[PDB]
C-alpha cells in the first residue's frame, strides 16, 4: 500500500507544537495586530522542574549567560539546544510556572570583587548574607575566566606559612601552589585550613603590605550553622578583615553550590591581579562535584563513572589552574589554593579524589586511624607529597626537615616489630623511640597556630635529642616548656635573619641546657 510510508511520524524535534503555534495563531484574521510573543530576546518557560527550566525562545542568548526570570530569580543558560534552552535556576523553582517570561541579561556570570569584599559573608553569586548592607567598594568581574598562561607565571619561591607543625616541616607549602587536604569525615581537614587562615592573622601584622595574605574561605555544601560558627570564630580572632566568606550551603540551590568555588576564585583573583597575595580554600570540593553531578543529570547529559559527567575533571581543572604565582611583569601576585576532598572509608581510588589528586601539586592525607592514636593533626607522613619540595621550604626548617623525613621513614618501617616486648635490638629501639619523640612532637591543639620560628626551634630541640631524656608521654608540655624557657631573642632574630646561622646555633644549643624538662 502506498500509504504505509507516511503511517508513523519521523520527528526531528520535540517541541513541534511550540513551533506550529507560532504560525497558526496568526492565521486567525483578528490576531494579526501584534498578537505574537517575541522570542528574539525573550523566552517562555516550557517545563519547570527540580531546579531546571527549559525555555523556548532566547535566540540571541549566549552559552553560560545569566538570564533572569520574571519571578525575580536568576538563572544560567547552560544547554543551548536546537529548539530550546536548558536553563538552570539559582534559587527555588517553586516561583516558576509554565508560560513565564525569561529575560536574558546579556551578561556572562558576574560577581562583585574588590577591596570592599573583605569580611563579607556572601553567596556563590555575590549577595552578602551577613546583614551589613550591600557591597560598597567593589567592581563586577567575570566568574569563569581564562587561567594564566605559561608566560604569565613564574617559579614558586616564597613560602606560605601554615602554622601547623606537621605540615610546615614535612609537606611545605609555597605561596602559589595548589595543596589538597584529603581525608575522611571528622579527620581534621577544615581545622587545618582554619589554622592556615588564623596564622595569616598572626603573620600579617609583622610583614609589609606587599607580603600580606588575604584569605578566602569557600564553604560549599556545609551547614549554615557551621559557617555561622566559623564567622563567629574568625570574628573572635579578628581575622575577618583578611577573610572573605563565600558560602553556598546545603539549603542553597545546586547551581549556587556549583558556582561557589568559581565565585570565590574570582573574588580571590583580585589580589592576584593587583600584586597582593591570596589564599583560597575550596572547602568540600567533593560536594561541589556532587552539585555539578545533580545539575548535569537533571540536564539529560549522559553519565559516566559514579554517574558523574565526563567533564568533571575539567570542572576542577579550570577552577584550580587559576591559582598561580604570577611573574614580575604581571604584578608578582599569588593565589594559593587549598581544595578539600572527602574520601569515604579510605577509598582514594574514587573518581573525584583521583582527579583532584592528579591536578594538585601537594596532598595532605589525613587518616582516621592515626586521628584516634592521639596524633592530631592526623597527617599520614608517608603518602603526603609536596611537589615544590625544598624550593619553597623555610630555611632553617630545611636544615632539620631532611632529618625529620628520614627518621620518620625509618620509624614507619620499624612498625610490625614493636609488638614483641622482649625483642630488643638497641638500634631499632633507638629509632623506634626517636620516631615516637618526633611523632608526639608534631602534635598541636586546634585554633592554635605557632609561628614558623618557634616551630623550627621546637623541632630542632627534638631532632637533636634535647627532649630525648624525657619519657614518651610528657612531650606535649615539654614542648611548651622549651618554647617558653628559652630567650625571646632566639625567635626574634630567627624570624628576621631567615635561617639558623652559625652565629645562632651555638646560642640555642646552650639555651636548651638551661631548660627544665618534666622528666629525667
Amino acid at each position: 500500500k502506498a500509504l504505509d510510508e507516511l503511517r508513523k511520524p519521523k520527528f526531528s524535534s520535540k517541541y513541534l507544537i511550540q513551533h506550529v503555534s507560532q504560525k497558526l495563531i496568526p492565521a486567525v484574521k483578528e490576531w494579526e495586530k501584534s498578537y505574537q510573543p517575541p522570542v528574539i530576546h525573550l523566552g517562555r518557560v516550557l517545563s519547570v522542574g527540580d531546579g531546571i527550566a527549559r525555555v523556548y525562545g532566547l535566540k540571541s542568548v549566549q552559552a553560560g549567560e545569566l538570564v533572569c526570570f520574571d519571578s525575580g530569580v536568576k538563572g544560567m543558560a547552560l544547554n543551548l539546544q536546537a529548539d530550546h534552552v536548558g536553563v538552570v535556576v539559582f534559587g527555588n523553582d517553586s516561583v516558576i510556572h509554565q508560560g513565564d517570561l525569561v529575560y536574558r541579561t546579556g551578561q556572562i556570570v558576574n560577581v562583585p570583587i574588590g577591596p570592599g569584599t573583605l569580611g563579607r559573608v556572601t553567596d556563590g553569586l555575590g549577595q552578602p548574607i551577613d546583614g551589613k548592607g550591600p557591597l560598597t567598594n567593589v567592581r563586577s568581574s567575570l566568574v569563569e575566566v581564562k587561567a594564566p598562561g605559561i608566560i604569565a607565571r613564574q617559579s614558586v619561591r616564597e613560602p606560605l606559612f601554615t602554622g601547623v607543625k606537621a605540615v610546615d616541616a614535612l609537606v611545605p607549602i609555597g605561596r602559589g601552589q595548589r595543596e589538597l587536604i584529603i581525608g575522611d569525615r571528622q579527620t581534621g581537614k577544615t581545622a587545618v585550613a582554619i589554622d592556615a587562615i588564623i596564622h595569616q592573622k598572626n603573620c600579617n601584622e609583622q610583614v609589609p603590605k606587599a607580603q600580606r595574605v588575604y584569605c578566602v574561605y569557600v564553604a560549599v555544601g556545609q551547614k549554615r550553622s557551621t559557617v555561622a560558627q566559623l564567622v563567629k570564630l574568625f570574628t573572635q580572632t579578628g581575622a575577618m578583615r583578611y577573610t572573605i566568606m563565600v558560602s553556598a550551603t546545603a539549603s542553597d540551590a545546586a547551581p549556587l553550590q556549583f558556582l561557589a568555588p568559581y565565585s570565590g576564585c574570582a573574588m580571590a583573583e583580585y589580589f592576584r591581579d593587583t600584586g597582593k597575595h591570596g589564599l583560597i580554600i575550596y572547602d568540600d570540593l567533593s560536594k561541589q562535584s556532587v552539585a555539578y553531578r545533580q545539575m548535569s543529570l537533571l540536564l539529560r547529559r549522559p553519565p559516566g563513572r559514579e554517574a558523574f559527567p565526563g567533564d568533571v575533571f575539567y570542572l576542577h581543572s579550570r577552577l584550580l589552574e587559576r591559582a598561580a604565582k604570577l611573574s614580575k611583569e604581571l604584578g608578582g601576585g599569588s593565589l594559593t589554593a587549598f581544595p578539600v576532598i572527602e574520601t569515604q572509608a579510605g577509598d582514594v581510588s574514587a573518581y573525584i579524589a583521583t582527579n583532584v589528586i592528579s591536578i594538585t601539586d601537594g596532598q595532605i592525607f589525613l587518616e582516621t586511624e592515626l586521628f584516634y592514636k592521639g596524633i592530631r593533626p592526623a597527617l599520614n607522613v608517608g603518602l603526603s607529597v609536596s611537589r615544590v619540595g625544598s624550593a619553597a621550604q623555610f630555611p632553617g626548617m630545611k636544615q632539620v626537615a631532611g632529618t625529620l623525613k628520614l627518621e620518620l621513614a625509618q620509624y614507619r618501617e620499624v612498625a610490625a616489630f614493636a609488638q614483641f616486648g622482649s625483642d630488643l635490638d638497641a638500634a631499632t629501639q633507638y629509632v623506634l623511640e626517636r620516631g615516637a619523640r618526633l611523632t608526639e612532637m608534631l602534635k598541636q591543639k586546634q585554633f592554635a597556630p605557632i609561628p614558623i620560628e618557634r616551630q623550627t626551634v621546637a623541632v630542632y630541640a627534638a631532632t637533636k635529642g634535647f627532649l630525648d631524656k624525657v619519657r614518651v608521654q610528657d612531650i606535649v608540655a615539654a614542648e611548651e616548656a622549651v618554647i617558653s624557657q628559652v630567650n625571646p631573642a632566639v625567635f626574634k632574630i630567627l624570624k628576621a635573619n631567615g635561617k639558623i646561622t652559625p652565629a645562632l646555633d651555638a646560642h640555642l644549643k646552650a639555651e636548651l641546657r638551661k631548660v627544665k624538662l618534666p622528666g629525667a
Partner: protein
C-alpha cells in the same frame, strides 16, 4: 489569547497539533472546511510520488520543501489555516504527521458535531421494524444527548441477534454467544451437582 476549548482532550505531539487546529478553525468557524482540506491532502499524498518524497526522503533540503509547499498552496482557494499549517509542518519535516493529525482532528470534530458512531453486525439483512426497534435498545448505551449513527454489517457466524461495535465498548446481544454462555453455564453444574 482567547481560544475556544476543545470538546475532548487528547494525547501529545500529534494530537496537540490537531487540538490547536480545531481551536483555530473553531475561532474562524471553518471546522468542516479544513477537514475537507486535510482529506484532500491525504488523498493527494496517495496520488503522486513527488509529494510523498517530501515526507519520506531524508535528503531533501528544507528550503526546497518549504518553497514547494508555499508555491503549491499559493492558490486554489485554500484556507489561511491549512496554508500556514502546511508551511509550519513542511518547515520542520513534519509532513508525515499529517496522517495522524487528521485522525485526532476527526475525533475532535466528531465530539463537536455531537455525533458518535456504532456498528451493528448481524446475520440477515435487517428489516425496517428490526431497525427501528434496534435504535431504541442501542440508544440506552450512549450517555448523553448525542447523534449515535447505526452502521450495518452482515456476518453468518452469528445465529441471529445483534452485536453493537461502539469502537470502545461492545454489546454482544447475539444468540451465538447466548448459546455459548448457555453451554458454559450447564457444564459448571454437571461437574458439581
Amino acid at each position: 489569547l482567547k481560544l475556544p476549548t476543545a470538546p475532548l482532550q487528547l494525547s501529545g505531539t500529534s494530537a496537540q497539533i490537531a487540538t490547536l487546529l480545531w481551536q483555530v478553525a473553531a475561532k474562524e468557524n471553518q471546522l468542516d472546511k479544513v477537514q475537507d482540506e486535510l482529506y484532500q491532502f491525504i488523498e493527494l499524498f496517495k496520488q503522486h510520488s513527488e509529494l510523498r518524497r517530501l515526507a519520506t526522503d531524508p535528503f531533501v533540503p528544507t528550503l526546497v520543501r518549504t518553497k514547494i509547499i508555499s508555491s503549491v498552496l499559493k492558490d486554489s482557494g485554500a484556507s489561511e489555516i491549512t496554508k500556514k499549517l502546511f508551511e509550519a509542518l513542511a518547515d520542520e519535516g513534519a509532513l508525515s504527521a499529517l496522517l495522524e493529525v487528521t485522525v485526532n482532528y476527526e475525533e475532535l470534530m466528531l465530539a463537536h458535531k455531537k455525533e458518535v458512531y456504532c456498528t451493528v453486525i448481524t446475520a440477515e439483512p435487517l428489516d425496517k421494524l428490526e431497525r427501528v426497534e434496534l435504535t431504541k435498545k442501542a440508544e440506552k448505551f450512549v450517555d448523553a444527548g448525542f447523534k449515535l449513527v447505526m452502521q450495518e454489517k452482515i456476518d453468518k457466524k452469528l445465529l441471529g441477534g445483534f452485536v453493537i461495535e461502539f469502537s470502545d465498548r461492545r454489546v454482544d446481544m447475539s444468540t451465538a454467544k447466548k448459546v455459548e454462555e448457555f453451554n458454559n453455564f450447564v457444564n459448571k453444574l454437571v461437574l458439581s451437582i
